[PDB]
Each structure stands twice: as C-alpha cells, then as structure tokens.
C-alpha cells in the first residue's frame, strides 16, 4: 500500500 | 545502505 514495492523512496535502506 | 532513501524499491509501503 502508497504506491511502488515495499517501504519508503528507492532500493535499499537508507540514504544514497 | 543500498542506494536510495528508506527501505524497499520505491515510494511509501508494499507493491503498487
Ligand atoms: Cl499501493
Ligand atoms: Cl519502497
Ligand atoms: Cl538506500
Ligand atoms: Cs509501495
Ligand atoms: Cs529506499
Ligand atoms: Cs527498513
Ligand atoms: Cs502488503
């Protein structure tokens, strides 16, 4: 659920 | 770490 595929903005964890 | 910003590939929590 939001929109794309799991948690947040990206690929990964975290910042880069 | 990864590459990004969070947790995941994408833009909030899940898939869509
Ligand atoms: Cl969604
Ligand atoms: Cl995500
Ligand atoms: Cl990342
Ligand atoms: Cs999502
Ligand atoms: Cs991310
Ligand atoms: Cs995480
Ligand atoms: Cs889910």
Known sequence: ???XAXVXWXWXWXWX
């Open 1 to 3: 659920v939001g929109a």
